[PDB]
Amino acid sequence: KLPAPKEIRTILDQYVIGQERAKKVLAVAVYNHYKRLNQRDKKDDIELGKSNILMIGPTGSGKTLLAETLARLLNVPFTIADATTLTEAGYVGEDVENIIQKLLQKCDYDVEKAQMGIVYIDEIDKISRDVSGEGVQQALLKLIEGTVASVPPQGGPQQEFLQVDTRNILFICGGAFAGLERVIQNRSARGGIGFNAEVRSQEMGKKVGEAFKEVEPEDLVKFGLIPEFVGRLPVIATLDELDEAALMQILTEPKNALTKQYAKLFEMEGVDLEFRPDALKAVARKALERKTGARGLRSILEGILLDTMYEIPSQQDVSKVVIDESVIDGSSQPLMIYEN
């Protein structure tokens, strides 16, 4: 109950590796949000307005993880609804109502739980700029600020529809705004081309290191988002790119680190899973070029472990499997101590 922002930060830090800026923002944000649901006394202090957050980070930065991990600290219904599916009324496509509908399915159709729920609408950037654009934004505007639910009944007339007010729920929004770096580059040192220009470092996961630190509402409006929409979300969180230095600190440090999980499965048979410092770094580089980041580690690792994971059980007396940098690439095979 109402854990201190610092405690939340430490718990979230267990998995997240290097999101301090957003960590604090997200921590304080939820902390005060639930204090409003808690501070319901009648002392002329119910007027308090919620403040929705707008998480902007390159794909795979850790946005979803923060939302999901934080949901567990709350121990209440949480959901993630994509923004692409939603389309303005009058044309085929998901209706804004549906967001509440699916959200309530996780809540078990409990009004108290609904009001104390958190949303993580993703890919908000997609709906930028007659249909699938401003229309969706206009509809969403009312929904995020204030609206009554119309969720039809489950299982089993038209009056059966249930209602709940969308003025308590914290509607967090996560989006990978492709091109925002150029908008923020126009703020100062607009030069992209020329000898004395700010030409991008590279076309790898180094580009957006701290490019969103200087994100202002004006840029988001220029991006295409409605001015009103940008106003609705006052807080704007920023995430890093999870580059090679991050990926090296994310393959063993996290409590859920792939190496740890893989080691657990290997430990059962009796093989002491081992990794070399350079070996782990090698995987990071391979994931960055592949552009799969976080999601590329598992696959990459499975391509380097599964091979010997089908052998190890049939082999006996195995004591260790040393994974060398060479093994990561397609040159060598996992070194294994066949006997003791």
Partner: protein, 191 residues
């Protein structure tokens, strides 16, 4: 007439001229006599492609009978300044100025077709005036000649004395001959 082309990208269909479509692939074409107006386009194109992807290589096709020395220097100086590797693939002919750009490409990325002629000649200059002006304008055309000889010796690796001797008269070199000379790295025949 320049024929149009459609990319047919996922975002939608856009009409691009035959030259603009190839520009998206980091390709620049140098055709005709070298001059300030045409050379400036190559400069803008090279710089523009640097921002999109400063790591991906660039392919500069050279088919030109020569031209302004000053205009060419802006291209060579620009190619070396930028970070991306500027490949060169000589098609047709490559005269004095054209050959310099062909030799200015990145190491191991200079190419030429089989029936390609690469000629090297001294810089051409013309001026009229008093004896004092002639003496002043003679050191400039002689000083420039030294800079071009050093550039070829640097990329080709041949000694400076050989460059001056060869540049005295027109010397036509085929694909195979140019490889031994160091002007290019490989002669491509078939994919």
């Amino acid at each position: 007439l320049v024929p149009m082309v459609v990319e047919q990208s996922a975002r939608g269909e856009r009409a691009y001229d035959i030259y603009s479509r190839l520009l998206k692939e980091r390709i620049i074409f140098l055709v005709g006599q070298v001059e300030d107006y045409m050379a400036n386009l190559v400069v803008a194109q090279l710089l523009f492609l640097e921002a999109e992807n400063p790591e991906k290589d660039i392919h500069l096709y050279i088919n030109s009978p020569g031209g302004s020395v000053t205009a060419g220097m802006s291209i060579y100086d620009t190619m070396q300044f930028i970070k991306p590797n500027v490949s060169t693939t000589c098609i047709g002919q490559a005269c004095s100025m054209g050959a310099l750009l062909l030799a200015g490409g990145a190491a191991g990325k200079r190419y030429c077709l089989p029936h390609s002629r690469m000629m090297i000649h001294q810089p051409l200059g013309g001026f009229q005036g008093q004896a004092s002006d002639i003496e002043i304008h003679a050191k400039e055309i002689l000083f420039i000649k030294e800079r071009l000889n050093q550039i070829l010796a640097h990329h080709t690796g041949q000694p400076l004395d050989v460059i001056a001797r060869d540049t005295d008269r027109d010397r036509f070199m085929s694909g195979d001959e140019a490889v031994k000379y160091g002007l290019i790295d490989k002669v491509m025949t078939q994919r």
